Design a protein around this ligand. Structure first.
Ligand SMILES: Nc1ncnc2c1ncn2[C@@H]1O[C@H](CSCC[C@H](N)C(=O)O)[C@@H](O)[C@H]1O
Ligand code: NA
Lengths: 10, 376
């Protein structure tokens, strides 16, 4: 959700 | 950078100063959001930003080029003020803005103008707007790593290094306080962008070195530092999948670079120096697995290590984001069960019940050694 996918993004 | 590009960035800096860009951005996003995340002006909020310029800043032409840079909004070339018009043409020549096929408009290319921690920054616009996979990373983890730095403790003479600099944001933040900053990367695209962002904030090689060098080579080198920052690639993807240069961590569980860095801090930091790292760390209900590996640095080297956990997600909430990213990054079709591969990998290899977005502060030769883990 909101806050997810860090070192990934987009 | 070539001399023509350097002159263009100088003129861009002049324009941003003339129209007060950083203050405008700060007002639009507001002080309760400015340091939370770079994902504030995005495809989902662009219409609201355009409405603010039209209705609260009167649609003034002095802000037309600014919006091309902030959101990509088209401006009529002939409506640009004289000084802004020549700069717009120079940005189009540089590939930093686009012209419409008939030459009558200027609009966004692949670079988005933001401000963070008091610096002005171009980033890869595809991370917040549509399109192909982005090639330069920035995110909330980038911001939180800088948030925990004690700026008043930085001396002008302190030697600082930002490993894996990307857009340059951490190096540029450090350059607000110390006159000696080293910024490193190995990707062509981030290296060209930090060159631009260094000049955009009136720094040069005299106070900020940009170096093409692998972090493992910088870690084993003989240079010694008072202050280190690093947001390395830390994401672990299942076997058989390729990520990107900014995302894919080394080692079985994606944490190889974090192990490399922490293991060398007693040698690369001067005694009493401090390092700031950030990573989205897998763990069980108690906390991230990686923090269990750090006791050796407390008892073996007398370090103080503080871990600030600012966001917690169940592993199930990352299956969609990770699998979507893998599909987009490799151009895969929609008929393979990537979600199942991610799920199996989290369970068997990562032992991931939760992901913990964690900033880690590490200091050598600590007067009060120990590990402290902060959770809300
Ligand atoms: N072995 C390595 N040595 C140096 N940089 C590396 C590297 N492997 C990946 N990188 C770079 O590491 C960066 C990670 S993303 C972090 C970017 C920036 N520091 C921020 O916080 O927003 C990418 O820019 C990638 O190009
Ligand atoms: Na990262």
């Amino acid at each position: 959700x909101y806050x997810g996918x860090a070192x990934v993004x987009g | 950078m070539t001399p023509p590009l350097a002159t263009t960035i100088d003129r861009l800096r002049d324009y941003l100063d003339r129209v007060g860009f950083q203050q405008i951005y700060k007002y639009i996003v507001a002080v309760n959001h400015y340091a939370v995340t770079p994902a504030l002006i995005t495809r989902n909020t662009a219409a609201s930003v355009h409405h603010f310029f039209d209705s609260r800043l009167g649609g003034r032409a002095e802000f037309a080029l600014l919006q091309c840079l902030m959101t990509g909004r088209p401006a009529e070339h002939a409506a640009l003020p004289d000084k802004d018009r020549a700069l717009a043409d120079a940005l189009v020549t540089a590939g930093l803005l686009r012209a419409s096929p008939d030459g009558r408009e200027v609009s966004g290319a692949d670079r988005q103008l933001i401000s963070a921690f008091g610096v002005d920054l171009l980033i890869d616009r595809r991370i917040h707007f549509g399109g192909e996979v982005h090639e330069v990373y920035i995110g909330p983890d980038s911001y939180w790593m800088l948030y925990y730095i004690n700026a008043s403790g930085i001396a002008r003479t302190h030697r600082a290094v930002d490993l894996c600099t990307g857009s340059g944001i951490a190096a540029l933040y450090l350059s607000l306080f110390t006159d000696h900053v080293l910024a490193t990367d190995i990707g062509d695209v981030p290296l060209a962008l930090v060159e631009i962002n260094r000049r955009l904030n009136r720094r040069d090689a005299g106070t900020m070195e940009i170096r093409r060098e692998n972090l493992n080579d910088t870690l084993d080198g003989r240079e010694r530092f008072d202050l280190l920052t690093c947001n390395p690639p830390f994401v672990a993807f299942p076997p058989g999948y390729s990520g990107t240069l900014y995302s894919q961590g080394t080692g079985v569980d994606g944490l190889g670079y974090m192990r490399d860095i922490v293991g060398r801090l007693p040698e690369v930091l001067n005694p009493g120096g401090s390092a700031y790292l950030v990573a989205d760390l897998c763990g069980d209900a108690h906390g991230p697995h990686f923090l269990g590996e750090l006791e050796s640095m407390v008892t073996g080297h007398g370090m103080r290590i503080e871990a600030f956990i600012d966001h917690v997600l169940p592993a199930s909430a990352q299956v969609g984001p990770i699998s979507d990213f893998l599909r987009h990054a490799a151009g895969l079709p929609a008929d393979t069960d990537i979600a199942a591969d991610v799920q199996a990998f989290q369970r068997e290899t990562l032992r991931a019940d939760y992901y913990y977005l964690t900033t880690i502060r590490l200091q050598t030769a600590a007067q009060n050694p120990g590990l402290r883990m902060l959770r809300r």
